[PDB]
Amino acid sequence: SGAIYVGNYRVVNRHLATHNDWANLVWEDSSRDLLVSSTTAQGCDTIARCDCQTGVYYCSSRRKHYPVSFSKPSLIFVEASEYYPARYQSHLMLAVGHSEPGDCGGILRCQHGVVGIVSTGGNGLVGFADVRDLLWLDEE
Numbered sequence: 223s224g225a226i227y228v229g230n231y232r233v234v235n236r237h238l239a240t241h242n243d244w245a246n247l248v249w250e251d252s253s254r255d256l257l258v259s260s261t262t263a264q265g266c267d268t269i270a271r272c273d274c275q276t277g278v279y280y281c282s283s284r285r286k287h288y289p290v291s292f293s294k295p296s297l298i299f300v301e302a303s304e305y306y307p308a309r310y311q312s313h314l315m316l317a318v319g320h321s322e323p324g325d326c327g328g329i330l331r332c333q334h335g336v337v338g339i340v341s342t343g344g345n346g347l348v349g350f351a352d353v354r355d356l357l358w359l360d361e362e
């Protein structure tokens with residue numbers, strides 16, 4: 223589990239969004255596994271605006287943050303998980319590392335701020351849903 227709190231926005235994995243999230247919906251995209259809902263209190267996170275390919279991610283199934291190199295966001299085939307069938311996911315970055323389903327929502331961060339959240343795992347990789355293209359998160 224986990225979310226990004228930027229401005230008056232909450233960014234979660236679409237597959238983990240709550241009824242309150244859907245009732246306060248700003249934007250969602252199944253192909254990206256992302257949903258954004260509105261918040262009453264302002265958040266503590268800053269979104270990265272960059273093309274970094276190195277950063278650090280939180281792995282809840284290890285209680286650890288790991289430094290990783292990761293691919294640029296792309297359209298990637300993802301094998302079946304407990305929460306999605308085998309499918310193509312867009313805006314997905316991959317790194318070598320540990321990811322189980324409950325790790326979804328862990329933050330990946332670079333020197334510029336939050337890059338994205340854990341969205342995929344298995345076969346010794348961790349996949350992250352990028353948010354650095356979502357410039358509207360920074361205003362309004």
Ligand SMILES: CN(C)S(=O)(=O)c1cccnc1
Binds near residue numbers: 296297311312313314
């Ligand atoms: C490069 N990829 C194909 S992607 O999925 O990250 C992407 C990026 C921008 C717009 N639409 C899709």
Ligand SMILES: [Zn+2]
Binds near residue numbers: 271272273274332334
């Ligand atoms: Zn960066």
